[PDB]
Amino acid sequence: SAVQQKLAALEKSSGGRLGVALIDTADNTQVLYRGDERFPMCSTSKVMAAAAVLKQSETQKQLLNQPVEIKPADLVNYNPIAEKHVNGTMTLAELSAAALQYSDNTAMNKLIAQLGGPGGVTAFARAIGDETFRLDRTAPTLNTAIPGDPRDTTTPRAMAQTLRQLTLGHALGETQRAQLVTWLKGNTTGAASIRAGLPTSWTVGDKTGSGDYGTTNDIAVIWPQGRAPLVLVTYFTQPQQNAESRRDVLASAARIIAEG
Ligand SMILES: *C(=O)[C@@H](NC(=O)[C@H](N)c1ccccc1)[C@@H]1N[C@@H](C(=O)O)C(C)(C)S1
């Protein structure tokens, strides 16, 4: 197509490896660029963890109100919210909000522990039909993003298909799906990524990701006004370990997609 040429041109101008997957839910067509290649998810895998706890809430009705201790030894590299409740407690609802809207790594590790380890997160992915998603490590070592390392990776095709079933499909209950949609719309970390390349009248819920080798990710569900919703995944990684983040590439990919 024409989007393929411009995405390939954007990737050439960036010096890195770009992966894009779009699903238009009006006709279920797919716009893929390197859609079957493996990319490090970094903190875009947090959506899987929050959705798995939400799935647990379908049986444990009062699970999200359960308090969880935040002790100093739980602190890691980036804890913007959990820093404020040390020697106190946060409920699983506020931990999911801290993980999704502020990318709190301590909040993520608390979701992983609630699920019985990273194997419990991958289990939820297989239970909803995702055979590519694999979580192998806790935060922050899941952000190492070594080239060729299969740990903590997924493909754009699989992540877009899964994100649709969670936010638009019916892998979750209504209260759970609406709670996940509300969380993603309140994200505070994606102003410079997918959101920066979309028409400002479009409402977006998204989750960003960052890691070593300049890894810059963003997955998003997009509601255009007067049009069926869309799902967009943008993965980007770079050859140099000390590479700087490239959120501008994610915006440019979204603009190329939105024009399509
Ligand atoms: C996952 O994406 C997380 N990233 C990390 O833990 C990295 N070790 C890191 C990268 C850059 C600065 C500090 C730590 C969290 N999610 C990122 C994001 O959404 O962009 C993050 C920078 C907020 S940290």
Residue numbers in the entry: 28 to 287
Sentences from the paper on this structure:
We introduce the spitrobot, a protein crystal plunger, enabling reaction quenching via cryo-trapping with a time-resolution in the millisecond range. Protein crystals are mounted on canonical micromeshes on an electropneumatic piston, where the crystals are kept in a humidity and temperature-controlled environment, then reactions are initiated via the liquid application method (LAMA) and plunging into liquid nitrogen is initiated after an electronically set delay time to cryo-trap intermediate states. Traditionally cryo-trapping has been exploited to quench enzymatic reactions within protein crystals and thereby obtain structural information about reaction intermediates.
Here we demonstrate binding of glucose and 2,3-butanediol in microcrystals of xylose isomerase, and of avibactam and ampicillin in microcrystals of the extended spectrum beta-lactamase CTX-M-14. A sequence of electronic signals initiates the in situ mixing reaction by shooting a burst of picoliter-sized droplets onto the mesh-mounted crystals using our established LAMA technology. After a defined delay time, the micromeshes are directly plunged into SPINE-standard pucks submerged in liquid nitrogen.
